Amino acid sequence: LSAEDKAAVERSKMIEKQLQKDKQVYRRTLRLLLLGADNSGKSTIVKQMRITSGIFETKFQVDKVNFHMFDVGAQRDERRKWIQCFNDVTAIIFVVDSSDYNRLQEALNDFKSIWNNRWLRTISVILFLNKQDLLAEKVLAGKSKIEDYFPEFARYTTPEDATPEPGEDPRVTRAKYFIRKEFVDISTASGDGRHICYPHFTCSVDTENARRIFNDCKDIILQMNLREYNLV
Amino acid sequence: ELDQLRQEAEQLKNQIRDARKACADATLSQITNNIDPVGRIQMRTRRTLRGHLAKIYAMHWGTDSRLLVSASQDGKLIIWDSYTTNKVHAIPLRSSWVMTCAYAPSGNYVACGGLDNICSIYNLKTREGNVRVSRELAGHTGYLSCCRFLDDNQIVTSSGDTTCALWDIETGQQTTTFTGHTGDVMSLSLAPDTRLFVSGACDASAKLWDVREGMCRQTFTGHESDINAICFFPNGNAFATGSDDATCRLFDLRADQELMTYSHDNIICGITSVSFSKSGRLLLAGYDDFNCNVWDALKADRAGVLAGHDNRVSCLGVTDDGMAVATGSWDSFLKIWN
Amino acid sequence: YFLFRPRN
Amino acid sequence: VQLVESGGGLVQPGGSRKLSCSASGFAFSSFGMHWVRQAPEKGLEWVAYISSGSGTIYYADTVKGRFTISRDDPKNTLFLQMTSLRSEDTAMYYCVRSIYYYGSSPFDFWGQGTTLTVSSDIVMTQATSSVPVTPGESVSISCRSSKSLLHSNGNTYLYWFLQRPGQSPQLLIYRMSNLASGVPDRFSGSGSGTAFTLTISRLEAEDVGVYYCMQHLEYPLTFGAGTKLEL
Amino acid sequence: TASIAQARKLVEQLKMEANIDRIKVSKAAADLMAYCEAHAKEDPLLTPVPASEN
Amino acid sequence: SHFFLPVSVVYVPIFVVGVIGNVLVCLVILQHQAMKTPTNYYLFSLAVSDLLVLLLGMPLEVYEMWRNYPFLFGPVGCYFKTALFETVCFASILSITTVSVERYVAILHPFRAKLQSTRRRALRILGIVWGFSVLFSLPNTSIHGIKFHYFPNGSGSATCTVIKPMWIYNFIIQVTSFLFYLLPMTVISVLYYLMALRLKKDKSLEADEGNANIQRPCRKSVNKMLFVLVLVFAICWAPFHIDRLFFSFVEEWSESLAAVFNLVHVVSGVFFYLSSAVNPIIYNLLSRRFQAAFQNVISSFHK
């Protein structure tokens, strides 16, 4: 092996050293995909996670674990292709505007398409039912009523096991739990246990959204460990 | 107006159909029925390139077919010396989600792009010794799917925005934008003369484009799927397509119709990449089922399989001298077959 | 009289 | 791109002196760096080597032990700490960069040099010490080696350098036939496994100087005595 | 405006595609087969080369 | 040779089952790289340890039940047998313990587990495990030799036996039982109990709306399997150290004491080898990851 070939091998090994140094970072960072229509407050979540470009890498840290959150902000309506890249992500953060009842069916169908995708089938969805303040105002004011868009709301009781926060008006609780039930119903069919949904009622002003993602990712990694370590 | 125009379009489509049918004097399978079978092709993995951290989305050969660029979602491009397995360069990307990469035919530049919607042209021959961004060609309103150099100053690109574009690298501006497909454009292949190129999109059609000005001289319209892969026959008179209906189809630019359909009932998985051998007898197709299949481009029989990958075969390419087949996969390995 | 040995 | 050597001057025999070279305008860390000496009014002679990341170090048998080569990548500085300096160590010391990968051009840049005043290996023979010529003529400088520089991998590891009066050597051809960046096509390399020839196809006033051959097959890197071109 | 303009663009594109000259599929197949036969010897994958030439 | 037939009858099923199971593990872990993860390195080391225990003990035990005195190898073989058997036993025990610790960190600190989980760490821990296994084997090996019933009177018999004095052997056996059965069992039990507690809770137990939708489907099998693992370790390895301590303690063997010791040895052997037979079943089989990998490998064989 010539002198120049030996030096080339040395350069290759020094590239491999750098690649290992980068592999550490790659393994230690949890990837998240942030999806949601323009009506969803996903942009406000991005801005308040304050710890023509088609991808917007957002980086934040909670309890000394590093999160990379990806928003595909400037790409066409169809996603059946570029969504394939995002398997091997820890979770999909799906943000939906709970207030605009006209768009709720579109959001439900989008959630279905995400949940039942061939590649995402192993990927959990963190479901932020955002703009709960607007939902409270809307259902309290009564100017728009969910029954007109979802007829089954006329026959839906608040679950007896629910745990409303203090100050919860019964109608607000019932509406939000019905929306959550619709999303969870889409989630539970064809789940096959390999991936699960984590619904959260949130407002884009809420600083706790980072803790929600931290806890949900902790649970996701816990299930992945259960399977990886042969416990299940 | 609108309904009259639709009637005119449908009548023109029927005219094209009639002309293509009138040109169907015989099938390729009939003419090639007499030619000797290619026999079994037992290619073996001569090298395995172990560098990448994440899935290998794309690769391209140099024209002096020894060097080899490959892209992965970890944000690295690695320039590989296939003979020695050494890593020539490792290029840190500003966007992690690189979906395509290309090696300039002069070997001076390497392009890459992806969800960033930016075609980043990297200069490998800097006097500083580092690899450096020459241009960040921006203009696509969607993810980049394929990039191919025509020369050190012209790079054609395809994007999810349904349009392909020809770029003047020095100017950093689109010389010509090719009127959109109906869906996302997924694959490109430059004709050997570099005057024509063919593009495949998520609509089940492939469009032949004239680089001199952006007119789709021909549109090929047989598929029940999205065309993930496209490659020109070495003489530039035909091009092969791959799509998620698990069929490859060979189209002729002079008969304006599909000559041959490479399909087998056991193949339900989609096709991710397509490339010919130098002579054109072998059509190599990558599949979601982790395998790459070698097809007799004339007889349509399967000549063999490359079986070494443990995850989706993502990209494959045959050296310009035909010595070797590279195959990248989501398993993070490139395996060279010969 | 017989003795196994302690499986050392 | 620059390489400014510093540390020269008068040193009494047996003394010690540290040379330095401030690298700027290129990725110092990626380049292996060389020290090459030139005894006053004589030819080039290789001194020491330190690879990228300091993983490999070589010294000429003439300087082993006396000289230690080190680099400080964050400061982009290369060092050559000399001890027990002999009178034979008097020379102008050039800092030379080299980068090694398929298609790279080692020895492509030489610093301006610093002067140090005191008080089995492949041998390359250049047939002529001087050649008189005028512009417009074609000159074929020739070289020969004691061992075939054509390695099994197909590379013929012969380098050519032009040193104009008062300048540091400039790389012309790195493999026996590959032309360096910034060198006119007038220069054209050729050779066999053991005999080599550099053809200056159309001479110019800028071409006058001493032309040195070098081998990069084995490590004691040996330069030829140098063929001078005189107007 | 835009809708009928798009329809006119489609009509014109279909027109220019219809006007192209087309050869018989038999001749195209013969040409591809001829190229394959002519360049068979130069394909290392089709006919494996001796180990000394890799 | 009293027990040869009835004990071989029950040994053979254990031997076949354990060999098949551990060979299955060693195959599947290597056959495709999706199975080549750090925890599977520990499980592969355990499979190797149990396979070695079976192959190195089971044949010699039945042979000595066939005929005891004529021991075969000669001094070098006594050192090899003793040292290798001790090493593989300690290796199996320490692999169980390290798998337990790794699972504990994986459950109570899942982010730490995902971040630290590397093949480098796995191989380093395996090296430490086998290093301790060979090192702690040496004290017990050093006191073993050949005893003879050969005399110069003129009127073979070379059993592999403790030659150096019995009190040091008893000290060695007591210390080994403490360090390699009592502390390992305590660690395993405490860690798996804490794992069961953590898998009972959710959201730091702030889940006022309940956790049955996610936790219980896994917990139902997980807590049972954890109990199974702890009980298998304790019950299968207790008779081993019981027989060792029994032999080390007694000063002079009455025939009744010898008979009861022989019964204890037979029962201990059956439980101990059932250990290495069931370890692959409960650690690798009966798990969804290994089931899927096994089906994939069988399909690859079915090409």
Unique residue bearing structure tokens 């399997």: F225
Return d(Cα D176, Cα D186) in angstroms, integer.
15
Q: How far is D197 from chain A (nearest CA, A)?
A: 22
Return d(Cα E50, Cα B159) in angstroms, integer.
43
Write down the CATH number for the domain with range B1-337. 2.130.10.10
Does residue F303 lie within any of the structural domains? no
Per-residue tokens: F36: 């080549």
Neighbours of chain B (3+ CB pairs under 8 A): A, D, E, F
Looking at the partner chain, which of B74, B115, B162 has a beta carbon nearest the beta carbon of A72?
Answer: B115
Task: Write out chain B residues lying below 8 Å of F32, CB-based.
Answer: 310
Decide yes or no: CATH 3.60.15.10 for domain D2-118: no
Q: Does A17 touch chain F (CB under 8 A)?
A: no
Task: Write out chain B residues lying below 8 Å of E22, CB-based.
Answer: 19-20, 23, 254-256
Q: How far is B131 from chain E (nearest CA, A)?
A: 30
Looking at the partner chain, which of A9, A18, A70 has a beta carbon nearest the beta carbon of B90?
Answer: A18
DSSP letter string, F237-258: HHHHHHHHHHHHH-SS--HHHH
Q: Does D32 touch chain A (CB under 8 A)?
A: yes
Return d(Cα A25, Cα A20) in angstroms, integer.
9
Write down the CATH number for the domain with range D124-229. 2.60.40.10
Q: How far is B58 from chain F (nearest CA, A)?
A: 22
* Helix (H/G/I), strand (E/B), else coil: F216: helix
Q: Does E34 touch chain B (CB under 8 A)?
A: no
Which positions in chain B have a beta carbon within 8 angstroms of at least one beta carbon in chain F?
310, 331
User: Domains in chain A and their CATH numbers?
Assistant: 30-228 (3.40.50.300)
Query: Could you list the residue range(s) of the whole structural domain that residue F222 is in?
Result: 4-201+216-298
Per-residue tokens: F119: 């093949």
Distances from the Cα of F205 to the Cα of F44, F197, F199, F209, F212, angstroms: 36, 11, 10, 10, 12
Residue from F219, F237, F230 nearest F191 by CA: F230
List Cβ<8 Å contacts ≥24 apart for E2-9: E3/B2, E4/B1, E4/B2, E4/B5, E7/B1, E7/B2, E7/B5, E7/B6, E7/B9, E8/B5, E9/B179
Q: How far is F262 from chain C (nearest CA, A)?
A: 6
Neighbours of chain F (3+ CB pairs under 8 A): A, B, C
Q: Which helix (H) or strand (E) holds D18?
A: strand D17-24
Q: What angle do CA E3, E9, E15 make, to 5 degrees?
A: 140
DSSP class of residue F32 equals: S
Residue from A217, A218, A225 nearest A93 by CA: A217
Does residue F47 lie within any of the structural domains? yes
Q: Which residues pair with D227 in a beta bridge?
A: D211
Cβ–Cβ under 8 Å, residues A70 and A32: yes
**What is the torsional sign of CA B229, B232, B233, B238?**
positive
Domain boundaries of chain D, sorted by first residue: 2-118, 124-229
Q: Does F206 touch chain A (CB under 8 A)?
A: no
Flag if F265 and C6 touch (Cβ within 8 Å): yes
Per-residue tokens: B226: 């999205």
CATH of the domain at F84: 1.20.1070.10
Task: Write out chain F residues lying below 8 Å of C1, CB-based.
Answer: 255, 258
Q: Does E16 touch chain B (CB under 8 A)?
A: yes
Does residue F209 lie within any of the structural domains? no
| F131-158 burial code (b ≥16 CB/10 A, e <16) | ebbeebbeebbebbbbeeeeeeeeeeeb
Give the residue from chain F lying closest to A62, CA to CA: F111
Per-residue tokens: A173: 């609780």
The number of helix segments (H) and strand segments (E) in chain A equals: 6, 6
Phi, psi of B204 (to 5 degrees): -80, 55
Return d(Cα A207, Cα A218) in angstroms, integer.
18
Looking at the partner chain, which of E17, E30, E43 has a beta carbon nearest the beta carbon of B322?
Answer: E43
Method: cryo-EM
Flag if B141 and A74 touch (Cβ within 8 Å): yes
Distances from the Cα of D119 to the Cα of D5, D18, D83, D94, angstroms: 21, 16, 14, 20
Unique residue bearing structure tokens 């070279």: D21
Q: Does B115 touch chain E (CB under 8 A)?
A: no
Residue from A71, A67, A197, A44 nearest A125 by CA: A197
Flag if A10 and D153 touch (Cβ within 8 Å): no
Give the residue from chain B lying closest to F303, CA to CA: B307
List Cβ<8 Å contacts ≥24 apart for A42-49: A42/A71, A42/A93, A42/A95, A42/A130, A43/A71, A44/A204, A44/A205, A45/A93, A45/A95, A45/A128, A45/A130, A45/A204, A45/A209, A46/A71, A48/A204, A48/A205, A48/A206, A48/A207, A48/A209, A49/A209, A49/A210
Q: Which helix (H) or strand (E) holds D34?
A: strand D32-38
Looking at the partner chain, which of B84, B88, B128 has a beta carbon nearest the beta carbon of D25?
Answer: B128
Q: Does E31 touch chain B (CB under 8 A)?
A: yes
Give the residue from chain F lying closest to A220, CA to CA: F110
Amino acid at B213: E
**Helices marked H in F109-182 — which ranges?**
110-116, 119-142, 166-177
Flag if A76 and B202 touch (Cβ within 8 Å): no
Cβ–Cβ under 8 Å, residues D130 and D225: no
Number of domains in chain F: 1
Q: What is the dihedral of CA B72, B75, B81, B86, to 10 degrees?
A: -110
Flag if D155 and A6 touch (Cβ within 8 Å): no
Return d(Cα A90, Cα A124) in angstroms, integer.
7
Neighbours of chain D (3+ CB pairs under 8 A): A, B
Residue B96 half-sphere exposure, CB side, CA atoms within 13 Å? 21
Return d(Cα B214, Cα D94) in angstroms, integer.
55
Q: Does B92 touch chain D (CB under 8 A)?
A: no
- 3-state SS string for chain B: CHHHHHHHHHHHHHHHHHHHHHCCCCCHHHHHHHCCCCCCCCCCEEEEECCCCCCEEEEEECCCCCEEEEEECCCEEEEEECCCCEEEEEEECCCCCEEEEEECCCCCEEEEEECCCEEEEEECCCCCCCCEEEEEEECCCCCEEEEEEEECCEEEEEECCCCEEEEECCCCEEEEEECCCCCCEEEEEECCCCCEEEEEECCCCEEEEECCCCCEEEEECCCCCCEEEEEECCCCCEEEEEECCCCEEEEECCCCEEEEEECCCCCCCCEEEEEECCCCCEEEEEECCCCEEEEECCCCCEEEEECCCCCCEEEEEECCCCCCEEEEECCCCEEEEC
- 3-state SS string for D37-80: EECCCCCEEEEEEECHHHCCEEECCCCCCCEEEEEEHHHCEEEE
Neighbours of chain A (3+ CB pairs under 8 A): B, D, F
Amino acid at B250: L
User: From the centroid of its chain, how far is CA D68?
Assistant: 19
Task: Write out chain A residues lying below 8 Å of F118, CB-based.
Answer: 27
Flag if B129 and D26 touch (Cβ within 8 Å): yes
Q: How far is D114 from chain A (nearest CA, A)?
A: 27
Return d(Cα F199, Cα B118) in angstroms, integer.
46
| B179-190 burial code (b ≥16 CB/10 A, e <16) | ebbebbbbbbbb
Give the residue from chain B lying closest to D109, CA to CA: B127
Per-residue tokens: E25: 């599929």
Round the CA-based radius of gyration of chain E to a whole number and report it: 22
Residues after which chain A has a gap (C–N > 2.5 Å)? 51
Strand order from edge to edge, sheet including B313-318: B45-49, B334-337, B325-329, B313-318
Q: Suggest the residue from B85, B86, B288 to mutate for an interface test with chain A (most A CBs closer than 10 A).
A: B86
Return d(Cα F234, Cα F218) in angstroms, integer.
24
Distances from the Cα of F45 to the Cα of F25, F88, F95, F97, angstroms: 10, 10, 7, 12
Distances from the Cα of B158 to the Cα of B117, B118, D66, F77, F155, angstroms: 10, 11, 61, 71, 99
In chain B, residues 259-318 whose CB comes closer than 8 Å to chain E: 259, 277-282, 294, 297-298, 318
Flag if A225 and F110 touch (Cβ within 8 Å): yes
Number of domains in chain E: 1
Flag if F287 and A230 touch (Cβ within 8 Å): yes
Round the CA-based radius of gyration of chain D to a whole number and report it: 17
Cβ–Cβ under 8 Å, residues D138 and D190: no
Task: Write out chain D residues lying below 8 Å of B81, CB-based.
Answer: 101-102
Query: Could you list the residue range(s) of the whole structural domain that residue E38 is in?
Result: 1-54
Does residue F211 lie within any of the structural domains? no
Amino acid at B303: A
Q: Does A223 touch chain F (CB under 8 A)?
A: yes
How many other C-beta atoms lie within 10 A of the C-beta of residue A223?
20
Flag if A10 and D51 touch (Cβ within 8 Å): yes
Return d(Cα F241, Cα F247) in angstroms, integer.
10
Does residue F236 lie within any of the structural domains? yes
Note the resolution in Å, 1 decimal.
Answer: 2.8
Determine if residue B213 is left, alpha or beta; phi over 0 gives left, psi from -120 to 50 gives alpha, anything else beta.
Answer: beta
Return d(Cα F157, Cα F147) in angstroms, integer.
8
Domain boundaries of chain B, sorted by first residue: 1-337
